[PDB]
Design a protein around this ligand. Structure first.
Ligand code: CL
Length: 122
């Protein structure tokens, strides 16, 4: 296999997302945490989003991340046309993974979400 792309900065401690079955975030001006399959990655600040639960073979087909030294914003669309976000702030540069299949979301987090490493098929 896959392509991957890293977003964000160097802080935090690494994590792996595991199978992409459900996602929620905590955000304010930037990302406090991402919660993947009920597992928390990041801090306790900001506001907690609703949980997006993927339906049977649903996957992320478009994803937009705004980031700088931290992850500032996340949004995505799925192959079924469902949407998540945006959650976070303006700030950072924006980048979109367009018409892909996201297979893993790994990253690094502490009290905030420092970085994401997105693995995807083009
Ligand atoms: Cl930042």
């Amino acid at each position: 296999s896959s392509t991957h792309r890293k977003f964000g900065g160097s802080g935090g401690s690494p994590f792996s997302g595991s199978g992409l079955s459900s996602i929620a975030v905590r955000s304010g001006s930037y990302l406090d945490a991402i919660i993947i399959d009920g597992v928390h990655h990041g801090g306790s600040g900001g506001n907690l989003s609703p949980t997006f639960t993927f339906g049977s073979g649903e996957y992320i087909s478009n994803m937009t991340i705004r980031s700088g030294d931290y992850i500032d914003n996340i949004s995505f669309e799925t192959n079924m046309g469902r949407r998540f976000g945006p959650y976070g702030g303006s700030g950072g540069s924006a980048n979109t993974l367009s018409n892909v299949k996201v297979i893993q979301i790994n990253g690094s987090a502490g009290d905030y979400l420092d970085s994401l490493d997105i693995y995807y098929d083009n």
